[PDB]
Design a protein around this ligand. Sequence first.
Ligand code: U5P
Ligand code: U5P
Ligand code: MN
Ligand code: MN
Lengths: 293, 293
Amino acid sequence: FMVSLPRMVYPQPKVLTPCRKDVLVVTPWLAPIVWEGTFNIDILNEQFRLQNTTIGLTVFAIKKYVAFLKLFLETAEKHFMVGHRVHYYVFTDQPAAVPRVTLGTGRQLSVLEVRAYKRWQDVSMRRMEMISDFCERRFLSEVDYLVCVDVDMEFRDHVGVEILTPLFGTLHPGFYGSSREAFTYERRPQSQAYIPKDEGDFYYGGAFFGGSVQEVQRLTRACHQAMMVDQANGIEAVWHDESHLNKYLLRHKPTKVLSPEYLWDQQLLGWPAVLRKLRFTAVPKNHQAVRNP
Amino acid sequence: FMVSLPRMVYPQPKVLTPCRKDVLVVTPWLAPIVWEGTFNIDILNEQFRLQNTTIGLTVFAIKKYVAFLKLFLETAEKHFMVGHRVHYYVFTDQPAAVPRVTLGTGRQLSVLEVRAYKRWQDVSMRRMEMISDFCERRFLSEVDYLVCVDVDMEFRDHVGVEILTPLFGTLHPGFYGSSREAFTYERRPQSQAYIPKDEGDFYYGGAFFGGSVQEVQRLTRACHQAMMVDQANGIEAVWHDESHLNKYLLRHKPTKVLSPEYLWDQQLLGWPAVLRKLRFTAVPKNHQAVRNP
Ligand SMILES: O=c1ccn([C@@H]2O[C@H](COP(=O)(O)O)[C@@H](O)[C@H]2O)c(=O)[nH]1
Ligand SMILES: O=c1ccn([C@@H]2O[C@H](COP(=O)(O)O)[C@@H](O)[C@H]2O)c(=O)[nH]1
Ligand SMILES: [Mn+2]
Ligand SMILES: [Mn+2]
């Protein structure tokens, strides 16, 4: 049950004025595509705070990637769901290396110790299994929504309740303007992640997805089960968990899609005019070195 | 639980092309505004048919308004939710005057006998009470969604599952381009329907609203209870049930808003360029005569 919003003064929506003239703001299945200019955050904050919404944020920091936690968490404190209840879940093989970051009121952090796989591909892929497992261990009783992100990132601007919905994916910053033929889906029919050249809505990034706990558990269980089928068949999808996420979200359409404001790499892509805000961005990195002993 | 969509071939969404350049397609609280060009009905039909969705349609035909049922129901058979399960609920004081309209497979009609109030205003307003009552009598066990419409209308084009959502209102065709000061909300603070001049998102039409059974029961109960408070205080809202609906949807934002394609009067308003389709339209009528003995 939802109580009534209080009286609020804000600009009237303009029925005969598009909120964006340069981008698609709704998918063909009527899911909003979240860009700056599409939402009034004051209305949304009221709606979600009147439900005392709690957001869980999962992040994996395994092996050398513990080095990214301090900036990740500091900047999440500035920009992620401020004003709402937040529960960070840091999955790591090195509990003692988690930095002591000062948290605002109503925000808490749990360290979840997990094993480290040797190959970065397996570390990345086994997040699905690990998130799925903890949906029973903790998440269903502790949070309303889960947001599942890469750690080698920082928040630069607001990431708030405008993202929350039963199931969301994020447009990958390398492909948002691309034709579906150019998307790097898995193209081998032998893999469970296979998507034909004439199928696909978007290329979603594996580095930022989420939803209600129930929908995230479904997604993560399905992707883990598909990756186990592939393993038994001797195939590993071209882009690992991201390939399986794309297969899942083709077949199970998300109820919101986040624009690349929410998943960006300024070193590789700059700051195009179509991005009014750069919210969550890659940290400069030496891929080989940091993924390797 | 939602099964996977089958493989489908359709045009790729265009991230860098607005689906409409002339209208707002999402509200500031991220609810789609449903216009032609915003949705791929093939995707939506798959999603809703994989849930074996049943839609209830309520219509009141009391006193002389029984004359409107034949065209209403015939045209609903052509255009309303075709391919899905439909349950029509005809509320009337004259069961014997309900025309025998031939229904397609999977579609059924129930006649619900109710009393006739003398004043058209009370007939119109007491729909809230009557819909609310039947949410327990029948609707919760029989349908997934309810769509609640005026009878003095006809379907001219597709009205389908693109409208379905937890709670929807429809832009009134006389006000979709108007400033909120010009909206004919109730403006007397003594009424429960009161909305100040600096508040309001849209002017919704009382002639077409709906949602899940749970959300429609909430809306109708709240509006009936507010109309009973007003009656005890000797005030009747300026536009009756429509005034109370607007108060409710200001305080409880709808999860979709239908464009005026879905509620139109061609005699009074013509066929503007902004309407690509005229879906559900007024029948020519003599208001005084037909609302009177
Ligand atoms: O050695 C590794 C490799 C990957 N990851 C986790 O998996 C995510 C995806 O890997 P990458 O593409 O960012 O390297 C990382 O952001 C990080 O959360 C680790 O923690 N340690
Ligand atoms: O005598 C009346 C007056 C109103 N209505 C119902 O209430 C709706 C709203 O009234 P009106 O504004 O269309 O006249 C009508 O479409 C019809 O469904 C009746 O059935 N009989
Ligand atoms: Mn990364
Ligand atoms: Mn009418």
